[PDB]
Enzyme design. Sequence first.
Site, PDB file in Angstrom:
ATOM      1  N   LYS A  96       1.242  10.887   4.003  1.00 46.79           N
ATOM      2  CA  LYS A  96       1.923   9.690   4.269  1.00 46.79           C
ATOM      3  C   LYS A  96       3.615  10.087   4.499  1.00 46.79           C
ATOM      4  O   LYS A  96       4.336   9.521   4.975  1.00 46.79           O
ATOM      5  CB  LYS A  96       1.782   8.700   3.482  1.00 46.79           C
ATOM      6  CG  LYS A  96       2.416   7.319   3.864  1.00 46.79           C
ATOM      7  CD  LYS A  96       2.077   6.056   2.878  1.00 46.79           C
ATOM      8  CE  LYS A  96       2.679   5.014   3.097  1.00 46.79           C
ATOM      9  NZ  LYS A  96       2.348   3.755   2.414  1.00 46.79           N
ATOM     10  N   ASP A 131       7.920  -3.045  -6.077  1.00 47.70           N
ATOM     11  CA  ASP A 131       6.684  -1.754  -5.785  1.00 47.70           C
ATOM     12  C   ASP A 131       6.823  -0.400  -6.458  1.00 47.70           C
ATOM     13  O   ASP A 131       7.494   0.490  -6.049  1.00 47.70           O
ATOM     14  CB  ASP A 131       6.453  -1.579  -4.053  1.00 47.70           C
ATOM     15  CG  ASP A 131       5.031  -1.238  -3.988  1.00 47.70           C
ATOM     16  OD1 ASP A 131       4.350  -0.499  -4.773  1.00 47.70           O
ATOM     17  OD2 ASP A 131       4.921  -1.010  -2.724  1.00 47.70           O
ATOM     18  N   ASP A 158      -4.664  -1.087   2.794  1.00 50.13           N
ATOM     19  CA  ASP A 158      -3.335  -0.414   2.255  1.00 50.13           C
ATOM     20  C   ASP A 158      -3.662   0.975   2.097  1.00 50.13           C
ATOM     21  O   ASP A 158      -4.437   1.566   1.393  1.00 50.13           O
ATOM     22  CB  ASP A 158      -3.095  -0.848   0.772  1.00 50.13           C
ATOM     23  CG  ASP A 158      -1.932  -0.137  -0.136  1.00 50.13           C
ATOM     24  OD1 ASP A 158      -1.253   0.474   0.563  1.00 50.13           O
ATOM     25  OD2 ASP A 158      -1.877  -0.456  -1.321  1.00 50.13           O
ATOM     26  N   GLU A 191       4.231  -3.472   4.144  1.00 55.72           N
ATOM     27  CA  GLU A 191       3.564  -3.589   2.667  1.00 55.72           C
ATOM     28  C   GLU A 191       3.902  -4.890   1.936  1.00 55.72           C
ATOM     29  O   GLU A 191       3.387  -5.481   1.527  1.00 55.72           O
ATOM     30  CB  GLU A 191       3.603  -2.303   2.035  1.00 55.72           C
ATOM     31  CG  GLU A 191       2.785  -1.298   2.484  1.00 55.72           C
ATOM     32  CD  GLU A 191       3.020   0.366   1.879  1.00 55.72           C
ATOM     33  OE1 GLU A 191       3.899   0.632   1.131  1.00 55.72           O
ATOM     34  OE2 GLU A 191       2.546   1.090   2.676  1.00 55.72           O
TER      35      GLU A 191
END
Length: 385
Positions: free
Chosen positions: A71, A199, A10, A175
């Site tokens: 990211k 999330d 991850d 994800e």
Amino acid sequence: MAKAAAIGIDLGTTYSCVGVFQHGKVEIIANDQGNRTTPSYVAFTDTERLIGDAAKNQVALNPQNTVFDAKRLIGRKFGDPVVQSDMKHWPFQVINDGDKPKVQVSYKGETKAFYPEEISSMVLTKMKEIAEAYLGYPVTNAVITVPAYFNDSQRQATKDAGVIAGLNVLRIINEPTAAAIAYGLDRTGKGERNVLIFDLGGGTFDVSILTIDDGIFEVKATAGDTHLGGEDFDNRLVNHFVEEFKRKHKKDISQNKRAVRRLRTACERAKRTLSSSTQASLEIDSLFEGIDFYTSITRARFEELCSDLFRSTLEPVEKALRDAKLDKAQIHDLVLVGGSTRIPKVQKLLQDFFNGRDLNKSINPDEAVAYGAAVQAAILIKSTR
Ligand SMILES: Nc1ncnc2c1nc(Cl)n2[C@@H]1O[C@H](CO)[C@@H](O)[C@H]1O
């Protein structure tokens, strides 16, 4: 041996996690400091390059050369308004190399510049070495996860980060799909299964709705807030304690960078305690001008301090349901992802919104994505033989 082995990674915005599926179970691998998640930070110093915990630990002393949030840049053009907006909030320099962003730092006394995929490759290299130290042999096959809204350029730059890191990328998976795999939600037999993934991480909030029709995953909707996470809750605690210090001592600490950072890390710690206790204690020796700051806070006060932020997580949930054209009762499963979903008030708000429904939360939410990626990496390497 090594060729029949695969890891699941991850690669998170603020933290990364690595898992391996062996002997019928997922093992989330602890790093050399015993942590099951590793900060997605890379520091460039006068002598070395630091990755993870050691990089996050010296961020205050070296902010210009400590890179994080790569990211947010990966697979994007320099001219992208997301890049231009984010750049204003980072202490490190972002430069333009032919419409491609590069992070520019000082390393061993020299100016060096890195592509976001090169930064993310250093994080991936660390996750690969963490797995290798646990296994006792080099593992190179990996499944790497990305947000469900990542386009082709972001997915390709993530795969490129994997290649630079010396990993054979078996697949780039979403994800929320990895999270649904972690809970075995793709193995319920026949018929369309609607899954909502909530999330809430350290710096981003994502809501995803998936339909699982006979093992096949389909993304129906994505919603959220790219600038909402656990760090906003730490900051609400900081402002409270800055006001309390001012009421007790008639001194404003907000300008003392060291005092604010020590208070911030203590607040993050107290916030975590508040997920399993109804009170938490702060114990800061000589916070400002030799004054100790020994205090406490109830979970009730913390919930008041973040009340508007916790409530705001339900607007992307409703938005995702309308985009997916589904009513609440049409959602079969609710999955929690991200460390911030451990907050009891957040769980209560989501459960009440879904009319008292059970939440899938038995897997450490900050580990569920790496868990599912590890399961998928094992299935994929077995099919490769
Ligand atoms: N027990 C907890 N109670 C509340 N917040 C938590 C908890 N654990 C983590 Cl990690 N976080 C936060 O999750 C983020 C990383 O996913 C960070 O913001 C961390 O503070």
